[PDB]
Enzyme design. Structure first.
Site, PDB file in Angstrom:
ATOM      1  N   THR A   1      -6.280   6.749   7.626  1.00 29.85           N
ATOM      2  CA  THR A   1      -6.771   7.013   6.284  1.00 29.85           C
ATOM      3  C   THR A   1      -6.821   5.762   5.422  1.00 29.85           C
ATOM      4  OG1 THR A   1      -4.612   7.646   5.360  1.00 29.85           O
ATOM      5  CG2 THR A   1      -5.950   9.367   6.381  1.00 29.85           C
ATOM      6  N   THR A   2      -6.457   4.617   6.006  1.00 29.50           N
ATOM      7  CA  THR A   2      -6.516   3.339   5.294  1.00 29.50           C
ATOM      8  C   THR A   2      -7.262   2.358   6.202  1.00 29.50           C
ATOM      9  OG1 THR A   2      -4.409   2.459   6.177  1.00 29.50           O
ATOM     10  CG2 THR A   2      -4.258   3.688   4.157  1.00 29.50           C
TER      11      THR A   2
ATOM     12  N   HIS B   1       0.857  -1.190   0.000  1.00 30.84           N
ATOM     13  CA  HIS B   1       0.000   0.000   0.000  1.00 30.84           C
ATOM     14  C   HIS B   1       0.891   1.238   0.000  1.00 30.84           C
ATOM     15  CE1 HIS B   1      -2.155  -3.214   2.389  1.00 30.84           C
ATOM     16  NE2 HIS B   1      -2.828  -3.136   1.255  1.00 30.84           N
TER      17      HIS B   1
ATOM     18  N   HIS C   1       2.187   9.145   1.092  1.00 29.26           N
ATOM     19  CA  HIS C   1       1.071   8.945   0.178  1.00 29.26           C
ATOM     20  C   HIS C   1       1.532   9.857  -0.962  1.00 29.26           C
ATOM     21  CE1 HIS C   1      -1.489   7.052   3.279  1.00 29.26           C
ATOM     22  NE2 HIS C   1      -0.893   7.856   4.146  1.00 29.26           N
TER      23      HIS C   1
ATOM     24  N   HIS D   1       3.469  10.945   6.787  1.00 28.83           N
ATOM     25  CA  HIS D   1       2.748  10.646   8.008  1.00 28.83           C
ATOM     26  C   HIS D   1       3.704   9.988   9.001  1.00 28.83           C
ATOM     27  CE1 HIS D   1      -1.325  10.262   5.727  1.00 28.83           C
ATOM     28  NE2 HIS D   1      -1.027  11.541   6.001  1.00 28.83           N
TER      29      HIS D   1
ATOM     30  N   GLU E   1      -3.177  13.629   0.960  1.00 28.97           N
ATOM     31  CA  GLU E   1      -4.489  13.197   1.438  1.00 28.97           C
ATOM     32  C   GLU E   1      -5.245  14.430   1.907  1.00 28.97           C
ATOM     33  OE1 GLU E   1      -3.587   9.473   3.995  1.00 28.97           O
ATOM     34  OE2 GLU E   1      -4.563   8.755   2.175  1.00 28.97           O
TER      35      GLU E   1
ATOM     36  N   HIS F   1       5.383   6.868   6.855  1.00 25.17           N
ATOM     37  CA  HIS F   1       5.116   6.483   5.469  1.00 25.17           C
ATOM     38  C   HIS F   1       4.635   7.714   4.707  1.00 25.17           C
ATOM     39  CE1 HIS F   1       1.234   6.199   7.553  1.00 25.17           C
ATOM     40  NE2 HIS F   1       0.715   6.667   6.433  1.00 25.17           N
TER      41      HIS F   1
HETATM   42  N1  LIG Z   1      -2.259   6.896   6.714  1.00 26.73           N
HETATM   43  S1  LIG Z   1      -2.354   6.914   8.282  1.00 26.73           S
HETATM   44  O1  LIG Z   1      -3.647   7.292   8.862  1.00 26.73           O
HETATM   45  O2  LIG Z   1      -1.287   7.662   9.031  1.00 26.73           O
HETATM   46  C1  LIG Z   1      -2.070   5.269   9.010  1.00 26.73           C
HETATM   47  C2  LIG Z   1      -1.257   5.024  10.136  1.00 26.73           C
HETATM   48  C3  LIG Z   1      -1.073   3.740  10.651  1.00 26.73           C
HETATM   49  C4  LIG Z   1      -1.687   2.667  10.065  1.00 26.73           C
HETATM   50  C5  LIG Z   1      -1.502   1.271  10.627  1.00 26.73           C
HETATM   51  O3  LIG Z   1      -0.798   1.119  11.602  1.00 26.73           O
HETATM   52  N2  LIG Z   1      -2.134   0.186  10.039  1.00 26.73           N
HETATM   53  C6  LIG Z   1      -2.091  -1.211  10.450  1.00 26.73           C
HETATM   54  C7  LIG Z   1      -3.068  -1.597  11.434  1.00 26.73           C
HETATM   55  C8  LIG Z   1      -3.782  -0.554  12.117  1.00 26.73           C
HETATM   56  C9  LIG Z   1      -4.760  -0.823  13.107  1.00 26.73           C
HETATM   57  C10 LIG Z   1      -5.037  -2.166  13.423  1.00 26.73           C
HETATM   58  C11 LIG Z   1      -4.350  -3.252  12.762  1.00 26.73           C
HETATM   59  C12 LIG Z   1      -3.345  -2.964  11.748  1.00 26.73           C
HETATM   60  F1  LIG Z   1      -2.697  -3.958  11.126  1.00 26.73           F
HETATM   61  C13 LIG Z   1      -2.505   2.873   8.939  1.00 26.73           C
HETATM   62  C14 LIG Z   1      -2.721   4.151   8.380  1.00 26.73           C
HETATM   63 ZN   LIG Z   2      -0.733   7.551   5.956  1.00 23.27          ZN
END
Ligand SMILES: NS(=O)(=O)c1ccc(C(=O)NCc2ccccc2F)cc1
Ligand SMILES: [Zn+2]
Ligand SMILES: [Hg+2]
Length: 258
Positions: free
Chosen positions: A196-197, A62, A94, A117, A104, A92
């Site tokens: 945001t994901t 991603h 975007h 981010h 974003e 990371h």
């Molecule tokens: N673009 S952003 O908003 O900064 C963003 C920050 C962290 C994650 C993350 O840790 N995902 C994995 C994850 C998150 C929560 C629970 C299980 C997971 F595998 C995703 C998006």
């Molecule tokens: Zn992000």
């Protein structure tokens, strides 16, 4: 099938497997500078990245994440609208297929070439997994990237991307200093939002920096040469991995500056 950014599993489809996508505090949003409320009671941000220990960089299909050792209070964020200490766990980006898109969050509808981010979790919760079950569990520092002059501090990242071209690839990435990615001013906008994901959990206090950092065209070009796909599978370039702005609903964006 699994979520993505394409025609058939893109943002407009996420709500089907993650109902929260249509929630009340979703991110990202468009920051209307004229409607944001200047809040003088907001303290200045305190970023302590002097003891940051980076471990590795990986392509998760991603985006690419640079992970940090968060077992101790090495790199932390405090101040601003936060209560308590938040530990940096990963950062990371975007980005877009063209220089005119990629971020974003947007400022007065203006899209930047990319967005950084820096993800932090509230130490009060013991671990990241518990933090995501709380309304104030995470704090993400958002920084916009505009195309212009090269950012020296970003070059170490750019050089290793070749090793993590495809989904699932990871490379050791020690001694990277995240301080080389900050603009000179720490002025910011803040609002309560979400990841945001997927899973799109509404556990985040968003802190978006006013001043963008600039990166050369050649630097962002390298981001675009990454693959969404894993090795051996058909090639799908990793671009436009950004979610469109969500409705603000009943939230207020506060600014730490006038
Ligand atoms: N673009 S952003 O908003 O900064 C963003 C920050 C962290 C994650 C993350 O840790 N995902 C994995 C994850 C998150 C929560 C629970 C299980 C997971 F595998 C995703 C998006
Ligand atoms: Zn992000
Ligand atoms: Hg949450």
């Amino acid at each position: 099938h699994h979520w993505g950014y394409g025609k058939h599993n893109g943002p407009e489809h996420w709500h089907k497997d993650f109902p929260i996508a249509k929630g009340e505090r979703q991110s990202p949003v468009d920051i209307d500078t004229h409607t944001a409320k200047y809040d003088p009671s907001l303290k200045p941000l305190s970023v302590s990245y002097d003891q940051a220990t980076s471990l590795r960089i990986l392509n998760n299909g991603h985006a690419f994440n640079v992970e940090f050792d968060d077992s101790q209070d090495k790199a932390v964020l405090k101040g601003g609208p936060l209560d308590g200490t938040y530990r940096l766990i990963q950062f990371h980006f975007h980005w877009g297929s063209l220089d005119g898109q990629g971020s974003e969050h947007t400022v007065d509808k203006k899209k930047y070439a990319a967005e950084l981010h820096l993800v932090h979790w509230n130490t009060k919760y013991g671990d990241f997994g518990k933090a995501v079950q709380q309304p104030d569990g995470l704090a993400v520092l958002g920084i916009f990237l505009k195309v212009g002059s090269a950012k020296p501090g970003l070059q170490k990242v750019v050089d290793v991307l070749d090793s993590i071209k495809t989904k699932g690839k990871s490379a050791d990435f020690t001694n990277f200093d995240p301080r080389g990615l900050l603009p000179e001013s720490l002025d910011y906008w803040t609002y309560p939002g979400s990841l945001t994901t997927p899973p799109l959990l509404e556990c985040v206090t968003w802190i978006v920096l006013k001043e963008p950092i600039s990166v050369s065209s050649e630097q962002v070009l390298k981001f675009r040469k990454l693959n969404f796909n894993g090795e051996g599978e058909p090639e799908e370039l990793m671009v436009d991995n950004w979610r469109p702005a969500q409705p603000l609903k009943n939230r207020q964006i506060k600014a730490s500056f006038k």
